[PDB]
């Protein structure tokens, strides 16, 4: 793809993440499901294309597949661990 700047990021090419200016990251996976994550927040919103959105909070348990896909988001957290004044 011939493009300079991309506002979407592909994780492992298993999922696609859209960067929102409000600090929200929308990550869709290849299985057709989508996840909404807020920066700095552990409570995420998972949407399944069967018409089922479930909200995960720190007081909520993920099923196997949900935890599995959530694991891939760790890469973005590590990307924020890059030596920057916004990191401590």
The total of other beta-carbon atoms located within 10 Å of residue 1's CB is: 3
Distance CA 61, CA 45 (A): 13
Structure-determination technique: NMR
Read off the DSSP letter of residue 73: T
Q: Which of 6, 7, 61 is nearest to 46 (CA)?
A: 61
Domains of the chain by start residue, with CATH: 1-88 (3.30.1120.30)
Distance CA 17, CA 62 (A): 20
Helices first, then strands: H and E counts in the chain:
2, 6
**How far from chain centre, in Å, is Cα 45?**
10
């Amino acid at each position: 793809g011939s493009a300079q700047l991309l506002k979407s990021v592909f994780v492992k090419n298993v999922g696609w993440a859209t960067q929102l200016t409000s600090g929200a990251v929308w990550v869709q996976f290849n299985d057709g499901s989508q996840l909404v994550v807020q920066a700095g927040v552990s409570s995420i919103s998972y949407t399944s294309p069967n018409g089922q959105t479930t909200r995960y909070g720190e007081n909520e348990k993920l099923p196997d597949y949900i935890k599995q896909k959530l694991q891939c988001l760790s890469s973005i957290l590590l990307m924020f661990s890059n030596p920057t004044p916004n990191f401590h």
